[PDB]
Design a protein around this ligand. Structure first.
Ligand SMILES: O=P(O)(O)O[C@@H]1[C@@H](O)[C@@H](O)CO[C@H]1O
Length: 490
């Protein structure tokens, strides 16, 4: 087998699966770990965008009542250290101690906020465990298939502790941990005792190449088999080589800019709404994305299924209203900082460059401030910043509720004084089953989101990869790389 050399944009701070939730963590953690239910993106010859939920660590699952699901686990499955996977390891993954409890915030900061209203799991036998919520939740199944639900070994994780585990992970996945050099590389090796589709690569290296041109030159040489985080501008050049090609897909994620609403200037919606109304998304998509990126009609995505609004109007673009709002706002003329981690997000810097000019034309002075991975300044020193949100559920709950809800970081850490009506609808959608009431409640939250502007949605990025033609791999419609029955050489 061949060793896989990967030229990546970045690496996560940890390899503990919940703490690795980012654009850069899931590509690694998906190799180390497994979920109970898995998504089969290639089901019915789909080009990596199928929504089909297949059995993984659980051979079968059965919803008992409105607040519980029983999972019958795959027998004799082994963790990388040779320890057999049991219902005990699954109960711990979804336990109050490790995940959703008050104590777990020290270990996993976004655990409770990103979690459902869980109750302690019920272990029936070695291969039988019931996952449950304290209040009715039909979201259990979708949470279980997600990046929040990768199965950790109870004893190994408990002995090490959350932090040390993220530096030396052990899972049941197709690839086992070898090395983690912070701000440099992650090296994984083939797990030949893997249940399910066998590793086709002997080793996988995730090499940090912060500059995309150095990444493209690295492939053309070539130091790499597959390179990540490119722009549609790179397409014509990579495809000019008969041994190389691009592989792109629209991903179930959105690029955005957000605010620190703790800062006096961003306390009122007026300036945030003014900055939102001046963002010309159609020209940004032409200039930087060659028409490949998608502009959603608010916090509305097709992956939401029954909770997606296909008849929803586009987000408002109004230059004269933006001018009028900057005028009535407290804004003096003082330049506002916008923190960016270089090109961690594809088109991060060219996008901001365009927007600074769009905003200068309405009356706001915006300045770029770059930062290095792990050198993000205290919340106190930031005003505007870029971000992204992965739509990790087959429902509208994610990410509006975990990120922007009353228990999320946008309100609790970033000072968003959300209307009481917004938080009331957040609680309704969590418990309510699908219907007219829940659909309308999501649309009302979407209307409040655009009026309050706690964040400003830019677009759904077109995720561009580039690979050697002798490396057969297909991208998926998510911020991750799938190698299971999707990696071959020759
Ligand atoms: O944009 P990132 O920090 O790389 O990742 C975000 C997460 O911070 C979280 O908001 C969920 O969605 C990811 O894409």
């Amino acid at each position: 087998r061949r060793a896989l050399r990967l030229g990546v944009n970045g690496l996560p701070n940890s390899l503990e699966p919940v703490n690795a939730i980012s654009n850069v963590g899931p590509r690694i953690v998906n190799q180390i770990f497994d979920t109970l239910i898995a998504r089969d993106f290639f089901a019915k010859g789909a080009p990596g965008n199928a929504i089909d939920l297949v059995p993984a660590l659980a051979e079968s699952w059965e919803r008992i009542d409105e607040k519980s699901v029983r999972f019958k686990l795959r027998q004799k499955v082994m963790f990388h250290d040779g320890v057999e996977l049991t219902a005990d390891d699954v109960a711990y993954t979804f336990s109050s101690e490790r995940l959703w409890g008050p104590e777990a915030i020290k270990k996993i900061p976004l655990g409770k906020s990103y979690s459902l209203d869980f109750d302690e799991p019920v272990v029936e036998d070695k291969y039988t465990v019931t996952l449950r919520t304290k209040t009715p939740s039909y979201l259990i199944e979708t949470f279980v298939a997600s990046w929040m639900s990768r199965i950790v070994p109870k004893e190994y994780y408990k002995k090490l502790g959350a932090v040390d585990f993220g530096n030396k992970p052990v899972g049941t996945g197709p690839y086992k941990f070898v090395e983690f050099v912070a701000g440099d590389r992650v090296v994984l090796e083939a797990n030949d005792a893997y249940w399910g589709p066998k590793p086709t690569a002997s080793k996988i290296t995730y090499q940090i190449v912060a500059e995309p041109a150095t990444r493209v030159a690295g492939l053309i040489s070539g130091e790499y088999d597959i390179i990540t985080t490119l722009t549609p501008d790179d397409i014509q050049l990579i495809n000019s080589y008969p041994d190389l090609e691009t592989r792109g897909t629209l991903i179930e994620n959105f690029h955005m800019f957000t605010f620190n609403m703790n800062q006096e200037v961003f306390k009122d919606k007026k300036l945030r709404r003014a900055l939102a109304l001046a963002v010309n998304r159609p020209i940004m998509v032409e200039a930087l994305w060659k028409k490949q990126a998608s502009i959603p009609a608010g916090f509305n995505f097709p992956n939401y299924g029954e909770t997606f609004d296909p008849k929803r109007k586009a987000m408002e673009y109004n230059v004269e209203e933006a001018k009028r709002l900057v005028k009535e706002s407290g804004y003096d003329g003082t330049p506002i900082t916008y923190h960016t981690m270089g090109n961690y997000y594809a088109n991060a810097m060219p996008a901001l460059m365009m927007m600074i000019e769009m905003w200068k034309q309405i009356g706001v002075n915006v300045v770029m401030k770059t930062y290095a991975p792990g050198s993000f300044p205290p919340d106190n020193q930031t005003w505007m910043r870029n971000w992204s949100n992965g739509q990790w559920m087959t429902d509208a709950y994610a990410t509006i509720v975990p990120e922007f809800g009353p228990n999320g970081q946008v309100q609790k850490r970033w000072g968003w004084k959300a209307p009481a009506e917004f938080n009331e609808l957040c609680q309704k959608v969590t418990v309510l089953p699908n219907g007219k009431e829940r659909f309308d409640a999501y649309n009302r939250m979407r209307d409040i989101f655009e009026e309050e502007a706690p964040a400003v949605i830019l677009y759904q990025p077109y995720d561009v990869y580039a690979a050697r033609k002798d490396v057969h791999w297909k991208p998926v419609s998510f911020e991750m790389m799938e190698f299971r029955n999707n990696l071959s050489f020759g």
